[PDB]
Design a protein around this ligand. Structure first.
Ligand code: CDL
Ligand code: CDL
Ligand code: PC1
Ligand code: PC1
Ligand code: 3PE
Ligand code: 3PE
Ligand code: 3PE
Ligand code: LMT
Ligand code: LMT
Ligand code: SF4
Ligand code: SF4
Ligand code: SF4
Lengths: 44, 115, 318, 155, 52, 94, 144, 52, 176, 51
C-alpha cells in the first residue's frame, strides 16, 4: 500500500490566527482617583 | 582645596588614559585609513558647509526661557520671607507670564520647525 | 586621606561602569530570548575586561580632516566631567559637601554637552556633524523642563543641598507627593543621558554612529565609559530625589545597601526601556518636552509654590 | 626571563582580541541573512562577545557576506581601509570566496581576496548560520596563535 | 524564522536556496512526519504575532 | 517546561497570556527523527496499455500564435469588468 | 519551590564528580547540566542526552581533551565529531551508533581527522593529470 | 490551487507606513489561515508531472 | 473577500474619553509593552551551546562533496560527465581515459568549492550515486586554494564520511 | 523561448524596482529619519532590484 505524508484521518486540530490582544486594567476614573489619593496622602 | 583636587584628579586620569591609548598601540597610518567616513564613498563637499537649522526659533526662545529658571531658582529661599503675600503673587505672576509667552509662541506656530 | 577617598570613588565607578555593560548585554539578551555573554569567563564575567583591554590596544585614528586639539579634548572632557558628577552625591556622605550641590550638577551636566558638540564638530565629518546638531536640539528640548522639575521638588526639600533630600524623606518617599514630577523627571534623564528611546546623537540606525563615528580604540572607550557612568549617576540622583533612604548615623552602611539597591533597579529600568520601545524622531522629542511636559511642569511649579504656603508646610531653610 | 613575559603578554592581548571581536555591520546579499540568523537567539553570537557595530572605526572584523560587484568594490576597500588595526576579514559564501554562481559575470569581482586580504574562507551558498559560527571560532583560534610579542622580542 | 528554515531543509536539504519548486512540480515528496511538525509550528505562531 | 510555578505565574501575568500552553521552544510534541520508510504512489501515466505518449504529449499540442490582424458593431473590453469584492464575514474590521 | 531549585543546582556538582569536575565542565563547555551518558567514541568524546530539554539542547558532546596528538582541553571544534556520531548529534537519526552501528567497509577511515586547515598537513590542490604534449629530445651525440 | 483556499485580503485606508505595517501583520495571520487549509486538504499522488 | 486593517471610529462617551485621557497621561499602553519584555526575561532562551550542541539537520542536507565507492572498493564514478553537464555553476571539471585495465574512469575530477552553489544537481544527475553532497558543513579554510578540490581530496572525503553518507542515503533514497 | 533547451531572454520583474523608484516621490516633505521608515515600508531586497 502507498505510504506518503498525509494529514490525520479527521484532519488537524483548529489553528488560531485572529488577532487577540486581551483587554486588561482598570478604568480612567479608578486610576486617576488612586493617583489623586496618593498625592493627598503625600501632601498631608 | 578638596574640590580642586577632585577636579584635577578626574581630568588627569582621563588625560592619562588618552595618553596610554595613543602611545601603547601599534600604529599604521596611511592616507586611505584616515580619510573621512561616509559609508564607503568619498564625501561630496566639505562637512564645514552650512547646515540649516529648522528649529532656529525654538533655540532663540530657549535663551529667554533659560533665563526664567535663573529667576525662578531662588524661590525656595523666597518662601522663607515673612512677606508671604507679596512673594506668592510675584512668584505666580512670573510663572503665568512664562506660560503666556509659551502659549503665544505655540499658537503663532513658533514651535513648529520650518520646512 | 582625601586622595585615598577620591580613588575609592573613581575606581569603583569605572568598574561599576564596566560591569554595567555586561549586565546590559545579558538583560537585553534574555529579554530577547537569548543569553548574551556567557563564554568569556564564567557567565561572561570577564567580557568587560576583554573589551577594555582590546579597545586600548587597538590603533587609534586621527581623521585627516579633523581639528586635532578639540578631537582629543572632547573625549577627555566627557570622562572627566562624568566622574565629577559623583563628588557631591551623598551615599550617605558626599565626597564634597556643597550648599548648592543640585545646581553644581546642572552646571556640570550642561558643560558635558560640549563634549558631544566638539567631538562631533572636530571630526569634520557629515555624520558626526549631524549627530552633534542633534545634541543641540536635544539639549534645547529637556534642560528648561529638567531644571524646573528640580525646583518643584526642592520647594518641599527647602534647599539645593543634596544631603537635605535625605532629611526631607525621613518619613516618606517624595515619589508619593510628586509622582507627576517623578514621571517627567525619569523621562528627562533618559533624554539627558542620550538613552533610548532618545538615543539620537548616536542614532545608530540613522547616523551609523552619530557624533562618535570617527572615534576608535581608547578615545572611543572614553565616550562609552562616560555615557554609562552618567546612566548610573542620574539613576542615583533619581533615587536620592524621589526614593529617599533612611539614614542611621551609627550604621551608615545600611543606608548604602538600601540606596544601592534602589539605584541598581532604576538603572535596570533603563535597560528594560531600551529593550521595549522604538526611537523618537528628534523633532518629536522637542515637541514632547515643549508641548506636554513644559505646560504641565509650569503648572506644577505654581502648585508646589502655593501648596506649602496654603498648607503651612514650608520646609526649613536650614 | 623576557621569553616567559612576552609569551604571557601575547596570551593576554590575543585573548582580549579574540574574546571581543566586533564585526562591521556590513552585508551584501543572500549570505547576510544567514549572518542575521547567527545573531538570532538560537546561536546568539553576542554570547561569544561578538557584537555588531556600524562604524568601521569601531570594528575588528569585516564579514564579506555576499556578492561583491565591480561597482561596490571601491566602497568595500574604502571601509576596510578605514578599519583600525588589527583587523581581520572573513569571506562568507561562494560569491565572496571566488565569485560563485556569478563567477563569469561582467559585473562581478571573482573573489573578494582580489580586493582585501582574507583570513578565513567559509564555504557554502549560503553557509548555514552554524557554518559561519564555525568560521568565526576558527578565526578566534587563529588569533589565539598570533605571536606578535614573541616575534618582536626576537627581532 | 529559524524553525521555518528547518521545513525548507527537511524537504530540500537547504535552509534557504532550496531549488525545490521546479517546472513540472516539486523535486521530492514531503518526508514523513513533516506536516505534523508544520502543524505544531502553525498552532503557536498566531500568539507570536500577538506579541509583536 | 522546567519553569517553577511562581515564575510561570509571573511571566503569564506580565504578558497577559497563558504562555505555557503555546511554548515557543519545542519539546516532545515534534516528530521522531527516524521515520518508517515511505512507499510513494505513481502517477497516472504508469500504465501498461492505452498509454501512447502521442495522446498525452502537452508540448506537441502547443501552437504558434493566432494572428488576429496583420499589416501584410459593439465595443468590447479585454474581459468583462471585475466583480466587486465583498467584506469578510470572518472579520470585516481588524 | 526555591529550595527544590537550589537542590537541583547542588545535585549538579555531585553529578559531575565533585567540584573539580564541575568546574572542569563549567570552564570547558560553559554548561553544567547533567545528562545521561549515551556512549563514548574511540577518540574520547562523550555523548549525553536529556529528553526533557527542548529540541536542540537534548543532545550534546563533551569533547575529548586530546585527539590525534593535539591538546584540545581548551581548543575544541565541531570537526572533532566522527561521522558515526555526527549523524546522531545533528538529529539526522534517532539511533546512536552504539545501538545502530554503521556498515563496515575496508576503505572507510579507521581514524577520523578534524579540520587540518592552517597546519602542515593541510590540503594543497594540484592537477591530477599527466603531461599532454611530449617534446622532442635532441640526440645526445654531435653529428653536424 | 489558490482558488481553493479561503482568505481575506487586508486593505489600508490612509496609504502610509502604519497602514502598510498593519496590512503585512494581518497578511501573516491570513497565511496561517491558508496553511491550515493546506495541511487538511493535502491530497495523495505524485509530485511532478508524469511525463519523463 | 477583504477586511479593513485600520478603519475605526472611537467612542465619545465620557468613560471612553477618560479611558483615553488616563492612557495618554499614565502611559498605560507603554507599561503594557514593558510587561511583554519582562515576560521574556523569565522565559528560557532559545540559545544552544555550540559547538557542544548542534542545530538539527535532516538526511537530505547538502554539505561538503564526496566521491563514493562500491562495497568492493571500486569507484562508483564512470566519467559519464552528467554532473559536469548539469552543474549550474560550471564548478566541476572532468577528464577521463581507459584505466590500465579496461575500466572507464576519471583522471581529473575537480570541484571549485568557491564556484559551487551547493545545489545538489550533481548528485541528482549522477546515475551511480558516485558524487554526493555529504552532511559536513564545518570545513572553512584559511586559504582560497584549499577550497579547490581535486579527485584525491574528494575520494578522501568519501572514505572519511562514507559511514554517515551511506546511512543518510539509506534514509532518503525511497523519496528519490 | 526560441524552441531550444536554453531560454533566449529572461526579463525579471521585481516589485521592489518600481517601489524604490518611487522613494523620491514618497519622501517629499519628510526628514532624514522618516526616509529610514519609508525604505523599510517598501520592503526592498536588492537581489531582485539589481538582479
Ligand atoms: C587636556 C587638554 C586636551 C587638549 C590637548 C590639545 C593638544 C592635543 C594634541 C594635538 O594637538 O595633536 C597634535 C598637534 C599637532 O598636530 P598637526 O595636525 O600636525 O597640527 C595641526 C595644527 O596644529 C592645527 O591644530 P588645531 O586645529 O587643533 O589648532 C590648535 C589649537 C589652536 O591653538 C592656537 O592656535 C594657539 C593657542 C590657543 C589655545 C590656547 C587657549 C585659547 C584661548 C582660551 C584661553 C584658555 C586659557 C586657559 O586649537 C585649539 O583651539 C585648541 C584649544 C584647546 C583649549 C583647551 C581648553 C583650555 O599638536 C602638537 O603635537 C603640537
Ligand atoms: C544582587 C542580586 C544577586 C544576589 C542574589 C543571588 C540570588 C541567588 C541566585 C541563585 C540562582 C540559581 C538557582 C539555582 O539553584 O540554579 C539552578 C540551576 C539548576 O536548576 P534548573 O533545573 O536548570 O532550572 C531552575 C528552574 O527550574 C528554572 O528557573 P526558574 O525560572 O523557574 O526560577 C527558579 C528560581 C531561580 O531564581 C533563584 O533561584 C534566585 C532568585 C534571586 C532573585 C534576586 C532578584 O526562582 C524561583 O524559584 C522563584 C523565586 C525567585 C525570586 C523571583 C523574583 C523575580 C523578580 C520579581 C519580579 C519583578 C522583577 C522586576 O543550577 C545552576 O545552574 C547554578 C548556576 C549558578 C547561577 C548563579 C547563582 C549565583 C548568582 C550570583 C550570586 C551573587 C554573586
Ligand atoms: C588584566 C587582567 C585580566 C586577566 C584575564 C585573563 C583571562 C583568563 C582566561 O584566559 O580565560 C580562560 C581562557 C579559556 O581558554 P579559551 O579562551 O581558549 O576557551 C575557548 C572557549 N571554550 C572554553 C568555551 C571552548 O584560558 C585561555 O585561553 C588561556 C589564556 C590566558 C590569558 C593570559 C593570562 C596571562
Ligand atoms: C580601562 C583601562 C584599561 C587599559 C588597559 C591597558 C592595556 C593593558 C594590557 C597591556 C598588555 C601589554 C600591551 C602590549 C600591546 C603592544 C601592541 C602590539 O602588539 O604591538 C606589537 C609590536 C610589534 O612590533 P614589531 O617591531 O615586531 O613589528 C611592528 C613593525 N611592523 C609594523 C613594521 C611590522 O610590538 C611592540 O610594539 C612592542 C611590544 C612591547 C610590549 C610592551
Ligand atoms: C572648556 C574646557 C573645560 C574643560 C572642563 C574643565 C573642568 C571644569 C570644571 C567646572 C568648572 C566650574 C567649577 C565650579 C565649582 C563650584 C562648586 C561649588 O560651588 O562648591 C564648591 C565650594 C563652595 O561650597 P559651598 O557649599 O557652596 O559654600 C561653602 C560652604 N562650606 O567652593 C570650593 O570648594 C572652592 C573652589 C574654588 C576653585 C574654583 C576653581 C574653578 C576653576 C574653573 C575652571
Ligand atoms: C512599570 C514599571 C516601570 C519601571 C520604571 C522604573 C522604576 C524602578 C524603580 C526602582 C526602585 C523601586 C523601589 C525599590 C525598593 C528598594 C527596597 C529596599 O532596598 O529598601 C527597603 C525600602 C524601605 O526602606 P526606606 O526607603 O529607607 O524607608 C523610607 C524612609 N525614607 O523599601 C521598602 O519596601
Ligand atoms: C489635588 C491637586 C493635585 C494637583 C496635581 C494633580 C495632577 C495629577 C495628574 C497629572 C498628570 C500626571 C502625568 C503627568 C506626566 C506627563 C504625562 C504626559 O505628558 O504624557 C503624555 C506624553 C504625550 O504623548 P502623546 O499622547 O503622543 O501626545 C498627547 C497629545 N499631544 O506622552 C509621553 O510622555 C510618553 C513618553 C514616552 C517615553 C516613555 C518611556 C518610558 C516609559 C516607562 C516609564 C515609567 C514611569 C516610571 C517613573 C519612575 C519614577 C522615578
Ligand atoms: C516591576 C514592575 C512590573 C511592571 C509590569 C508591567 C505589566 C503591567 C500589565 C498591566 C497592563 C497595562 O495597564 C492596563 O492595560 C491597558 C494598557 O493599554 C489599559 O487598557 C487599554 O489598553 C488598550 C489600549 O492600548 C485597549 O484595551 C483599551 O484602549 C484600554 O482598555 C488599561 O487601562 C491599563 O490599566
Ligand atoms: C500657568 C501654567 C499652565 C498654563 C499652560 C501654559 C501652556 C498653554 C499651551 C497653549 C494653549 C493654547 O495654544 C495652543 O494653540 C493651538 C492652536 O494652534 C492648539 O491646537 C493645535 O495644537 C495641537 C497640538 O500641537 C494640535 O493637536 C492641534 O491639531 C492644533 O489645532 C493647541 O492645542 C493649544 O495648546
Ligand atoms: S554565496 Fe549563495 S547565498 Fe551567498 S550571496 Fe552568493 S548566491 Fe547568495
Ligand atoms: S552542488 Fe550544484 S553547483 Fe555544486 S558542484 Fe553540484 S551541481 Fe555544481
Ligand atoms: S560523478 Fe556521477 S555524474 Fe559525475 S561523471 Fe562520475 S558517474 Fe557521471
Amino acid at each position: 500500500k502507498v505510504k506518503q505524508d498525509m494529514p490525520p484521518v479527521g484532519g488537524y486540530g483548529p489553528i488560531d490566527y485572529k488577532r487577540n490582544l486581551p483587554r486588561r486594567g482598570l478604568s480612567g476614573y479608578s486610576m486617576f482617583a488612586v493617583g489623586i489619593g496618593a498625592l493627598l496622602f503625600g501632601y498631608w | 582645596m578638596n574640590l580642586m583636587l577632585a577636579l584635577l584628579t578626574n581630568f588627569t586620569l582621563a588625560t592619562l588614559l588618552v595618553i596610554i591609548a595613543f602611545w601603547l598601540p601599534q600604529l599604521n597610518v596611511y592616507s586611505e585609513k584616515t580619510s573621512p567616513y561616509e559609508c564607503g564613498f568619498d564625501p561630496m563637499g566639505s562637512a564645514r558647509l552650512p547646515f540649516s537649522m529648522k528649529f532656529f526659533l525654538v533655540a532663540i526662545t530657549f535663551l529667554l526661557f533659560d533665563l526664567e529658571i535663573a529667576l525662578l531658582l531662588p524661590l525656595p529661599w523666597a518662601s522663607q520671607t515673612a512677606n508671604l503675600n507679596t512673594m506668592l503673587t510675584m512668584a505666580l505672576f512670573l510663572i503665568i507670564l512664562l506660560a503666556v509667552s509659551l502659549a503665544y509662541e505655540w499658537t503663532q506656530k513658533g514651535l513648529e520647525w520650518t520646512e | 586621606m582625601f586622595m585615598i577617598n577620591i580613588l575609592m570613588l573613581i575606581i569603583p565607578i569605572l568598574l561599576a561602569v564596566a560591569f554595567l555593560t555586561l549586565v546590559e548585554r545579558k538583560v537585553l539578551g534574555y529579554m530577547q530570548l537569548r543569553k548574551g555573554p556567557n563564554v568569556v569567563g564564567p557567565y561572561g564575567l570577564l567580557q568587560p575586561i576583554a573589551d577594555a583591554i582590546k579597545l586600548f590596544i587597538k590603533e587609534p585614528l586621527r581623521p585627516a580632516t579633523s581639528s586635532a586639539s578639540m578631537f582629543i579634548l572632547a573625549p577627555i572632557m566627557a570622562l572627566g566631567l562624568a566622574l565629577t558628577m559623583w563628588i557631591p552625591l551623598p551615599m550617605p556622605y558626599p565626597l564634597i559637601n556643597m550648599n548648592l550641590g543640585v545646581l553644581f550638577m546642572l552646571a556640570m551636566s550642561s558643560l558635558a554637552v560640549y563634549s558631544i558638540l566638539w567631538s562631533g564638530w572636530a571630526s569634520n565629518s557629515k555624520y558626526a556633524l549631524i549627530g552633534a546638531l542633534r545634541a543641540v536640539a536635544q539639549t534645547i528640548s529637556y534642560e528648561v523642563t529638567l531644571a524646573i522639575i528640580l525646583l518643584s521638588v526642592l520647594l518641599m526639600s527647602g534647599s539645593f543641598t543634596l544631603s537635605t533630600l535625605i532629611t526631607t524623606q525621613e518619613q516618606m518617599w517624595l515619589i508619593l507627593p510628586a509622582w507627576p514630577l517623578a514621571m517627567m523627571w525619569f523621562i528627562s534623564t533618559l533624554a539627558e543621558t542620550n538613552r533610548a528611546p532618545f538615543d539620537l546623537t548616536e542614532g545608530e540606525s540613522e547616523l551609523v554612529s552619530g557624533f562618535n563615528v570617527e572615534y576608535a580604540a581608547g578615545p572611543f572607550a572614553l565616550f562609552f565609559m562616560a555615557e554609562y557612568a552618567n546612566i548610573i549617576m542620574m539613576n542615583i540622583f533619581t533615587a536620592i530625589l524621589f526614593l529617599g533612604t533612611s539614614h542611621n548615623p551609627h550604621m551608615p552602611e545600611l543606608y548604602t545597601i538600601n540606596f544601592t539597591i534602589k539605584s541598581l533597579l532604576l538603572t535596570m529600568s533603563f535597560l528594560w526601556i531600551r529593550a521595549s520601545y522604538p526611537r523618537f524622531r528628534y523633532d518629536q522629542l522637542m515637541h514632547l518636552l515643549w508641548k506636554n511636559f513644559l505646560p504641565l511642569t509650569l503648572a506644577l511649579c505654581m502648585w508646589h509654590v502655593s501648596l506649602p504656603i496654603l498648607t503651612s508646610g514650608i520646609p526649613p531653610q536650614t | 626571563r623576557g621569553e616567559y613575559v612576552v609569551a604571557k603578554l601575547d596570551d593576554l592581548i590575543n585573548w582580549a582580541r579574540r574574546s571581543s571581536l566586533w564585526p562591521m555591520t556590513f552585508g551584501l546579499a543572500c549570505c547576510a541573512v544567514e549572518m542575521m540568523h547567527m545573531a538570532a537567539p538560537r546561536y546568539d553570537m553576542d554570547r561569544f562577545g561578538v557584537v555588531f557595530r556600524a562604524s568601521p572605526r569601531q570594528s575588528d572584523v569585516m564579514i564579506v557576506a555576499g556578492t561583491l560587484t565591480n561597482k561596490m568594490a571601491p566602497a568595500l576597500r574604502k571601509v576596510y581601509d578605514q578599519m583600525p588595526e588589527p583587523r581581520y576579514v572573513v569571506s562568507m559564501g561562494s560569491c565572496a570566496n571566488g565569485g560563485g554562481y556569478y563567477h563569469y559575470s561582467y559585473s562581478v569581482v571573482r573573489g573578494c581576496d582580489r580586493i582585501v586580504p582574507v583570513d578565513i574562507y567559509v564555504p557554502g551558498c549560503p553557509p548555514t548560520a552554524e557554518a559561519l559560527l564555525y568560521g568565526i571560532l576558527q578565526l578566534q583560534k587563529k588569533i589565539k596563535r598570533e605571536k606578535r610579542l614573541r616575534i618582536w622580542y626576537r627581532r | 524564522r529559524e524553525k521555518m528554515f528547518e521545513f525548507y531543509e527537511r524537504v530540500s536539504g537547504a535552509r534557504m536556496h532550496a531549488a525545490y519548486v521546479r517546472p513540472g512540480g516539486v523535486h521530492q515528496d514531503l518526508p514523513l512526519g513533516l506536516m505534523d511538525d508544520i502543524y505544531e509550528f502553525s498552532k503557536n505562531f498566531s500568539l507570536r504575532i500577538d506579541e509583536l | 517546561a522546567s519553569a517553577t510555578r511562581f515564575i510561570q505565574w509571573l511571566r503569564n501575568w506580565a504578558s497577559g497570556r497563558d504562555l505555557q500552553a503555546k511554548l515557543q521552544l519545542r519539546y516532545q510534541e515534534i516528530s521522531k527523527r527516524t521515520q518508517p520508510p515511505p512507499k510513494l504512489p505513481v502517477g497516472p501515466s504508469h500504465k501498461l496499455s492505452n498509454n501512447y505518449y502521442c495522446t498525452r504529449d502537452g508540448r506537441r499540442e502547443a501552437m504558434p500564435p493566432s494572428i488576429v490582424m496583420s499589416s501584410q458593431k459593439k465595443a468590447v473590453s479585454p474581459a468583462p469588468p471585475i466583480k466587486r469584492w465583498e467584506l469578510s464575514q470572518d472579520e470585516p474590521y481588524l | 519551590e526555591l529550595l527544590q531549585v537550589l537542590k537541583r543546582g547542588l545535585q549538579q556538582v555531585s553529578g559531575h564528580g565533585g567540584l573539580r569536575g564541575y568546574l572542569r565542565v563549567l570552564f570547558r563547555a560553559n554548561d553544567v547540566r547533567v545528562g545521561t551518558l549515551v556512549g563514548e567514541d574511540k577518540y574520547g568524546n562523550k555523548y549525553y542526552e536529556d529528553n526533557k530539554q527542548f529540541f536542540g539542547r537534548h543532545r550534546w558532546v563533551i569533547y575529548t581533551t586530546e585527539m590525534n596528538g593535539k591538546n584540545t582541553f581548551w581548543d575544541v571544534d565541531g570537526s572533532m565529531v566522527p561521522p558515526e556520531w555526527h549523524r546522531w548529534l545533528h538529529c539526522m537519526t534517532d539511533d546512536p551508533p552504539t545501538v545502530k552501528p554503521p556498515t563496515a567497509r575496508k576503505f572507510i577511515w579507521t581514524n577520523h581527522k578534524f579540520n587540518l586547515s592552517g597546519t602542515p598537513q593541510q590540503y594543497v590542490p594540484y592537477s591530477t593529470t599527466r603531461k599532454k604534449i611530449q617534446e622532442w629530445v635532441p640526440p645526445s651525440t654531435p653529428y653536424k | 490551487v489558490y482558488d481553493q483556499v479561503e482568505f481575506d485580503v487586508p486593505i489600508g485606508s490612509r496609504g502610509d507606513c502604519y497602514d502598510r505595517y498593519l496590512c503585512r501583520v494581518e497578511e501573516m495571520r491570513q497565511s496561517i489561515r491558508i496553511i491550515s487549509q493546506c495541511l487538511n486538504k493535502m491530497p495523495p499522488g505524485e509530485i511532478k508531472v508524469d511525463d519523463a | 473577500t477583504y477586511k479593513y486593517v485600520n478603519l475605526r471610529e472611537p467612542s465619545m462617551d465620557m468613560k471612553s474619553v477618560t479611558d483615553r485621557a488616563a492612557q495618554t497621561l499614565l502611559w498605560t499602553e507603554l507599561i503594557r509593552g514593558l510587561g511583554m519584555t519582562l515576560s521574556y526575561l523569565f522565559r528560557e532562551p532559545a540559545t544552544i551551546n555550540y559547538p557542544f550542541e548542534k542545530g538539527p539537520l535532516s538526511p537530505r542536507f547538502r554539505g561538503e562533496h564526496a566521491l563514493r565507492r562500491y562495497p568492493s572498493g571500486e569507484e562508483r564514478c564512470i566519467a559519464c560527465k552528467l554532473c559536469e553537464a548539469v552543474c549550474p555553476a560550471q564548478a566541476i571539471t572532468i577528464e577521463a581515459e581507459p584505466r590500465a585495465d579496461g575500466s572507464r574512469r576519471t583522471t581529473r575530477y575537480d570541484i571549485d568549492m568557491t564556484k559551487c552553489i551547493y545545489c545538489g544537481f550533481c548528485q541528482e544527475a549522477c546515475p551511480v550515486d558516485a558524487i554526493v553532497e555529504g552532511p559536513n558543513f564545518e570545513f572553512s579554510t584559511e586559504t582560497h586554494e584549499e577550497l579547490l578540490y581535486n579527485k584525491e581530496k574528494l575520494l578522501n572525503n568519501g572514505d572519511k564520511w562514507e559511514a554517515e553518507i551511506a546511512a543518510n542515503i539509506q534514509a532518503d533514497y525511497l523519496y528519490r | 523561448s526560441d524552441g531550444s533547451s536554453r531560454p533566449y531572454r529572461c526579463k525579471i520583474k521585481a516589485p521592489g524596482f518600481a517601489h524604490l523608484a518611487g522613494l523620491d516621490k514618497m519622501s517629499k516633505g519628510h526628514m532624514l529619519a522618516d526616509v529610514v521608515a519609508i525604505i523599510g515600508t517598501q520592503d526592498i531586497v536588492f537581489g531582485e532590484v539589481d538582479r
